[model samples]
Target chain A: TKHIILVRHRLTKEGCKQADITGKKLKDILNNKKVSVIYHSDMIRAKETANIISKYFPDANLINDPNLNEGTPYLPDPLPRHSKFDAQKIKEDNKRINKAYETYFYKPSDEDEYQLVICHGNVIRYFLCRALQIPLFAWLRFYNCGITWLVLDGSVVLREFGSVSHLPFESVTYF
Target chain B: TKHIILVRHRLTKEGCKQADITGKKLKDILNNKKVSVIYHSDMIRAKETANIISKYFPDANLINDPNLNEGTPYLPDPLPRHSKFDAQKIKEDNKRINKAYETYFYKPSDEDEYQLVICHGNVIRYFLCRALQIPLFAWLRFYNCGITWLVLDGSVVLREFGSVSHLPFESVTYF
Candidate 1:
């Protein structure tokens, strides 16, 4: 069975769009654990988090996927009724979301591989909903740097939900 | 009501001596979250983890209690048999654990308070069992730097169990 660990980006930088840190905590965590493969969104925040985390894994293979970017407007929050729903935008979003699912949900063969995905909170939430056959509104809870763990044999087995155990107390930003 | 977030220390430093880069990740997570108060075990690993996290909370109130350290390791694997069970050790550990519960399980009168405890995997897991009224052996599993969430309103309520979403994939070291 292959294990997939989903992660949200580090706290957004002060004013800059990229991630900012004092000692590169992600690096410490990554290097200490020796993670070697990572998939991150192309967004500045996600990429920044992945890059910093990649430092520790000398052999790490980091891939950037634009499809994993934050899905757009909050899911539970009602969209403006005055403006008609953007069917085109929704279609594009669905396509990307589906592709992400296919990519992450693939079944492994021969060996058990551990993989990490660095993406936005909404996308991670969306993955969870899709995996569990649950409603999209369930995406509202993950913290910024939270994690969700899943195992893919033939079917998906959720090992854990949004957890921010690695962060300090105040650092868990649940927006 | 009060919310208590229990955190295990970051990945143990190399060579089993003290804390290392994981501190950087925890610091980034802490500084980003702007958390202010923390309690931790006095062990080298726990203390190092707490000290790194406290740096971000400029007004942080960091306290160290040896009672919070690992708690005689009763959560997972087989219990040690060589030394046999020390009655005095268990009693001392039990006293500290109960005291910790009493101190943290109080009901809040006005506003809710957020507290963070940086400690060992077993200590955090034991606290969960104590709060949930389960056997200590039910501790199950905890990742290095994993977190457990609990809410108290005279009685304790579990919101989440051991989670280490804050750390990237391979970085999740479990014990």
Candidate 2:
């Protein structure tokens, strides 16, 4: 059994916004949880969010994957073996994004493991849609500081969604 | 065995800047529970959110109470009760707010009641603080569309907070 915890960044001030007390709040909630690895986008906000989570699991490996940036929409495009400007770039980014998505969030494991992913709303949504086999756009929204939990055995499943139960409403950010 | 379900309004187009989708998801979740009574603020959004819960228990009483509004600060007015203007109005509003707060959320009872209160974030916070004997500002927070469950039996106790686990992350809205 493997657990994947996905969370959006905390309240920010500027581009990516500097996080407020949410970091401390998250740190409190994540304390004592066994974490194997942590991943986040390169954006400062995501990094800051991951940094907060890192405090709780000092030994967990943390990786910054810029490919997880809010990418282009994954609209259904027929004839994938066809031609289009920047199509190849789009394909490559998507491939890398999904690969990272699955590697950290949906990898098969015999041991009970726990992982955490701190990234943008769109990135989280994209990954969830892929794991749940739902339309990519179907899960394209969540509150800032929202959380999603995925439990995987042979299959990826959702346990929680957009849960910001830890913080007060004042700390919420929707970006 | 009184169950107090504390929840905020569903997705709204205004202040929260979140598009609406939580109503239906909440409707689906509430349909599985036993709701005997429902209360909401007079605000359209709160009422709108309660309307969804209403669908699950058509026989339950639905209330629209204006006293549940997110009134002025719960802060200690330092300069004593002797104010410059409209002190009587301020005093009245606070009394009414607290009265309504306890009337719906904190009345001690042995009857097995299942109740739902859908209102603004601040109002929920105010009531929670009072019920738990904490500072009025202590629990002054919640996600838009979030739900807080309290198990009441003489004393108000919490079961969950800021929980939107019922909806997919896409539908979360933090006001």
Candidate 3:
């Protein structure tokens, strides 16, 4: 049983950053608790944040997901890469990409639970939207540093979104 | 009958921050056919490289592995990290991580006899070195974009580090 925690990462100079808070906060969050598993994007900022973020789940082990890299391009009226043709090749590519993102991965180890993932906004949002059966392109927006709480008891459900009860109002506005 | 071909990626501007020739040569070597299946790093570069080279293997499928990222880091030191930190708390973790990589992840997929992996140099090198029973540290090395050839017969005999024919000189090197 796992609840997929989706949240927009924190502020980045590149406008593509996510933070779990300063390293110490991450340390506090993890608190040396045994991490059964840890998955996250391998970006420098995210990696840095996770270095401390995963501290709680040290033994959780580490894995990186390309599919979880960034906010993916899931739009209602996505434009085809080809300016003229538009004969479904782009859709085919998107379908393949989406399927690959789902299937091409490491099957979780047996007896493993308590997984943590530090991923990009679009990707994390996409996971939430897709798993919840929401139109991936639906206009559900997330602010920077916003966290979405999910609950799964054999089925996935989004209990909350953009919850920033952790940070101060000013810091939260950085995004 | 199934065939197993060990493919080393082409030279990469990304690997080790210095390009590799074995990778480039491997790229040159594996042209004009379609792949029956493919395994690659989720990185765009790796995927692109797989597409570029896999043209030789018709109808080849593609797979991206988070487990196969940068190779698995293993320390033969008796007390690896978990044990050193808090032996009692991490026996379960060590077991789980070990089993994940050693068991399910170790076995090649059902129809993966002929597969190509485009991964970071260290990942491939480490896997080949370890599977074939070579000492992990200081045992072998891979130049950026280098390719090492291996022939595995499933634990029967690991002929550790056989041919390194791809890491030679070239004319089309980029600066």
Candidate 4:
């Protein structure tokens, strides 16, 4: 009955900038479409991109929660010893990320017809895999600013992971 | 006692681009000092003005709270209702703004201390007027990207506004 669209963010200055036209392109994609609400991870790059699309829903508020961040420390040349980001060491991070999503709920207190939750790559990617009951890390590699669209029909959910429908293969950057 | 510092932002584009050397001067003035917390009103012009100086505070968390934005929506062509601009309408907007500030704890939290807030000309004016419980329409004007520092002696407590010690023509700016 509902749909979820997941997209990775365009490259930040951290990478070669990735020739990002994603912000404008997203505005075009959702040109006339309306969204009920928005929720974003508290990262600057992702939230900045989401704001570009927020103009569509004048009434909706963008809520930021710390759990939705990349959930890993971004350090210089030396990586940490415990590897907080390593997939093998994913306990505290997973719990926090899950709790963050649970807080974003549209329970019967409803008014608007459509709802959009804008989040980062790791969070959206996990949502896709979990929807199909697939294992984590089973999804394809996501370049920065990639997008995935999903449709929910009855109890079944059909998801397109990292399709980048608005993007070309040559144009990819990880944020 | 909490330390409060006020500064007009380096230079902006609207009226005239500040001399390029001004950026270097601002950086040098802020050298060796560090910012612990940052809050900016949600506007690009304000954000852009804050951009170069904000880089100085990497560890400090920067949050874009809608309430804090320099929101003075005046006329399109002829400027505004008056040469000084309107505050009656500006006060009306702050009713919503005060709620947002309250939501984030109007009182200082355990982590709150020595905060830096960057907002636009009128928004800062509105905050000071409200804090002092002054009539909202009091005379107030700031040059582009102007900054104001306030000592939050805790909720419902404020000191006489501090001087904008960072700028050259502080005395001539208001009069």
- The top-ranked prediction according to lDDT is 2
- lDDT digits (tens) for residues A52-150 of candidate 1: 656555577998888887756624324665234665578888899888878877644324345678767678667766666664222221232344566
What TM-scores does chain A show, candidate by candidate in order?
Answer: 0.65, 0.64, 0.54, 0.58
Clashing residue pairs in candidate 4 are A8-A145, A9-A145, A36-A114, A144-A173, B41-B69
Residue A113 lDDT, candidate 4, scale 0-100: 48
- Which residues of candidate 1, in runs, are more than 4 Å off? A14-36, A74-85, A107-112, A134-145, A154-175, B1-175
TM-score of chain A, model 3? 0.54
The candidate scoring highest on DockQ is 2
Tens digit of lDDT per residue, candidate 4, span B11-35? 3564223322333443454456655
Worst 10 residues of 4 chain B by lDDT: B136-145
Question: Compared to the true structure, candidate 2 yields what TM-score?
Answer: 0.41
Model 1 agreement with the true structure over B93-130: per-residue lDDT tens digits: 88887777666555342233355777675666556556
**Could you give the candidate ranking by TM-score, starting with the highest?**
2, 1, 4, 3
lDDT tens digits by residue: candidate 3, B1-175? 2223444444445533222333345445555533456676656667766766555454678776655444334333455665475655346544543443463235554443445656555555545455556552223111322443344335232111122222223222111
TM-score of 4: 0.35
- Alpha-carbon runs more than 4 Å astray in model 3: A10-33, A71-112, A135-146, A153-175, B1-175
Q: Write the per-residue lDDT of candidate 4 for residues A1-175, one digit (tens) a residue.
A: 5455555654356321321344344445566665556667777776775665566456667777677777664333346664544644467787876775555431233232445566675676566556546542222211223544444443554333222222332222121
Cα lDDT tens digits for candidate 2, B10-29: 34455232212333444555
lDDT for residue A3 in candidate 1, whole number 0-100: 62
TM-score attained by model 3: 0.33
Could you give the DockQ of candidate 3?
Answer: 0.01
RMSD, every candidate, angstroms: 15.5, 12.2, 21.0, 21.7
Residue B158 lDDT in candidate 3: 16
